[PDB]
Amino acid sequence: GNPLVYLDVDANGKPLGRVVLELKADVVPKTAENFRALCTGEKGFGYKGSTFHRVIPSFMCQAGDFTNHNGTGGKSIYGSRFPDENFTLKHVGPGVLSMANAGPNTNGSQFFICTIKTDWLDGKHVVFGHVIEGMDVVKKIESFGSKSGRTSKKIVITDCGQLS
Numbered sequence: 265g266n267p268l269v270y271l272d273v274d275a276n277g278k279p280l281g282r283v284v285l286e287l288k289a290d291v292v293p294k295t296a297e298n299f300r301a302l303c304t305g306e307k308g309f310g311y312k313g314s315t316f317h318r319v320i321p322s323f324m325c326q327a328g329d330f331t332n333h334n335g336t337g338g339k340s341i342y343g344s345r346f347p348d349e350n351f352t353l354k355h356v357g358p359g360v361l362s363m364a365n366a367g368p369n370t371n372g373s374q375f376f377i378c379t380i381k382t383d384w385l386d387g388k389h390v391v392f393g394h395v396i397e398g399m400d401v402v403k404k405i406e407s408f409g410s411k412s413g414r415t416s417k418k419i420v421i422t423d424c425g426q427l428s
């Protein structure tokens with residue numbers, strides 16, 4: 265089966281709630297596993313204590329740079345970067361979970377949760393899951409963003425892990 269993972273998110277030290285994500289290990293097992301292990305922190309590093317560095321209303325919420333905290337970093341459980349597994353899953357609408365990148369075959373740890381259908385990203389960013397519950401929390405994160413992507417509050421992943 266597919267893993268269920270979670271992100272507990274805060275804004276300036278105040279809890280916003282929980283985002284539960286299904287990771288599509290049935291379609292992209294390598295990409296799903298990388299995200300799963302970064303949530304648990306079982307490799308000695310991961311998302312706990314990192315931020316949503318770029319939040320653009322009516323687009324997406326981007327996070328996962330746990331090394332540089334500015335959008336230039338992060339790393340995968342495999343190494344600094346890994347190939348694009350496939351582009352089978354599409355950016356069909358809000359709640360889609362997909363890999364950020366610096367062009368072809370540059371997946372690391374940065375990811376984004378869509379707040380609209382981002383179909384122009386199909387075949388360019390690897391989709392590997394979706395929001396199961398807590399889309400209201402994603403909308404709360406979205407409200408602290410701007411068209412520049414800059415946030416009005418520091419959005420932190422205070423805790424994360426695996427549910428099943």
Ligand SMILES: CSc1ccccc1[C@H]1CCCN1C(=O)CNC(=O)NCc1ccc2c(c1)[C@@H]1C[C@H](N2)[C@H](O)CO1
Pocket residue numbers: 318324326335336337338339340344345363364365366370371372373374376389
């Ligand atoms: C900016 S709004 C926009 C507009 C059109 C389309 C998309 C986007 C945004 C939002 C959706 C995903 N998205 C983006 O992905 C843009 N790109 C990066 O941020 N790139 C930074 C990055 C990420 C990941 C890795 C790196 C750099 C390298 C390579 C590798 N991973 C190593 O682990 C660390 O350094």
